Ligand binder design. Structure first.
Ligand SMILES: *C/C=C(C)/C=C/C=C(C)/C=C/C1=C(C)CCCC1(C)C
Ligand SMILES: *C/C=C(C)/C=C/C=C(C)/C=C/C1=C(C)CCCC1(C)C
Ligand SMILES: CCCCCCCCO[C@@H]1O[C@H](CO)[C@@H](O)[C@H](O)[C@H]1O
Ligand SMILES: CCCCCCCCO[C@@H]1O[C@H](CO)[C@@H](O)[C@H](O)[C@H]1O
Lengths: 220, 51, 51, 220
């Protein structure tokens, strides 16, 4: 059932949240923000999944079913993931503002489009899709250049997290298009199952990869 | 990736079987195309993670 | 592996659709379970080749 | 359709046959047998696929459809693959006799079982399954030990071909069990598609891997 999948997502996010919180208990003044950011990313996702598991935020409309908490979660957590990537890359305020702006357009577009019946939802998707390409450009270009100015360990971690992010985030728009929000070829169950998997990897997987590099970064 | 694919498959099978219990060929077809596309997407996800 | 999976998927979809054209839910279910198990096996094959 | 898949299998085998034949045109007296063996492996498979593509050898019985040419092909080509592996490993007559015997039991069992309606076909499968484990033991044990006495290049090629063989051959019994010969959960179309893929890899893929190592072996 959908509720079982939502609960599994919630449990997965909670386990991640607790792991990141504990892992950062004795973090230094320079690592602190990273652990706290990870806690926020999986923590908010955990709330969203619990809400959906309780059957709240389900929007069965225009003969399809979309989930408001999913998109609200994304709007709030993806910018924190970009913030984490930005911190590693060593961005200044201006640069942060640019990528957060692009990221926000992507997420707001997917949210609005998912709630809009009719072909107009594809225009909203398009807006998000273009903003996304701009975001990927920044992650692979300017931000990678910026990260290259830091330690070898930071550059390596940035690249690892950047690749996971670009590659997997690129999959979400296809699920949006093929799933309930779009042509609805994927059923709600299959749609939710794929997103639970992607979300856990992009947030919890992302986090454990960072945790696994912490010791090496301190040593260098 | 292997265990998950089987898990996803079981979930997809569950839908196909539930759809079949109605006797509506159209409902089964919907669940099946969803399962097929989903498994294909699952490969994309698995591959991306590995890379 | 990616292109082949899509090719296999198209073939499997072709069977599901042909089965659907009959209106027999049972026939569609047979084609769907076959497609699902087949895709799972296809992953096993792809993985073995890579390794 | 099934015929289209059989033709694709036939074309794939023919391309392989021609490539191996051409590649061995100027082979030395010590490499000769290897090229000729490869030609026989894909050559016989090509015939089997053409026969099936022409709609010959189709056995729709006991509410299932099995293909006699598939099993006849296997009975004749798998022992040549084992012979090729045996040549690389440097086996003597006795050792060759052992693995060819085991291999033959596996193939005859699958053939007989596929043609037998009723639960007795599972006993035949069992006979083949046990013989197969014995064959894998020889390939990974005694034969690998024997190969280790030859050049580094030969040992490496043996190991590469051995792994491809053990891993992929292990998949055929599951397709036999889940396919038409067994519980029939896989339709004839899906069954044939998977076997065409496996056959091309285990014969043509196998061959190109050998061809790709030829130059290195000559140089050492
Ligand atoms: C924590 C969850 C994550 C990392 C979610 C990421 C979501 C995306 C990268 C979504 C992207 C979309 C587009 C590029 C186009 C418009 C529709 C979206 C929102 C599905
Ligand atoms: C050229 C085609 C090849 C390499 C075929 C290989 C076939 C096998 C390894 C078949 C094995 C089987 C068993 C281990 C159990 C009984 C049934 C079989 C024949 C499907
Ligand atoms: C949970 C994963 C934590 C990874 C720790 C990454 C630490 C990156 O490195 C830190 O960046 C800070 C700037 O934001 C600097 O002030 C610190 O001196 C530097 O060590
Ligand atoms: C098509 C792929 C060909 C690979 C060539 C492998 C050659 C193995 O090596 C050959 O083995 C022979 C014994 O059978 C020896 O007599 C030869 O001296 C030796 O070079």
């Amino acid at each position: 059932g959908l509720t079982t999948l939502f609960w599994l997502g919630a449990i997965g996010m909670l386990v991640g949240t607790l792991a990141f919180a504990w892992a950062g208990r004795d973090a230094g003044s320079g690592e602190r923000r990273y652990y706290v950011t990870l806690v926020g990313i999986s923590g908010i996702a955990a709330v969203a999944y619990v809400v959906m598991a309780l059957g709240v935020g389900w929007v069965p409309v225009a003969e399809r079913t979309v989930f408001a908490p999913r998109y609200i979660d994304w709007i709030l957590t993806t910018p924190l993931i970009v913030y984490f990537l930005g911190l590693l890359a060593g961005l200044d305020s201006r640069e942060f503002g640019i990528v957060i702006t692009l990221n926000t357009v992507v997420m707001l577009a997917g949210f609005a489009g998912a709630m809009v019946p009719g072909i107009e939802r594809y225009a909203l998707f398009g807006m998000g899709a273009v903003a996304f390409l701009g975001l990927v450009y920044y992650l692979v270009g300017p931000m990678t250049e910026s990260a290259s100015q830091r330690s070898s360990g930071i550059k390596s971690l940035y690249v690892r997290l950047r690749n996971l992010t670009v590659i997997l985030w690129a999959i979400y728009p296809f699920i949006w298009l093929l799933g309930p929000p779009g042509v609805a070829l994927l059923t709600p169950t299959v749609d939710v199952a794929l997103i639970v998997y992607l979300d856990l990897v992009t947030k919890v997987g992302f986090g454990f990869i960072a945790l696994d590099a912490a010791a090496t970064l301190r040593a260098e | 990736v292997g265990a998950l694919t089987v898990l996803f498959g079981a979930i997809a099978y569950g839908e196909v079987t539930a759809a079949a219990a109605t006797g509506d060929a159209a409902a089964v077809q919907e669940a099946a195309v969803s399962a097929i596309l989903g498994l294909i997407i699952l490969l994309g996800i698995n591959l991306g993670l590995v890379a």
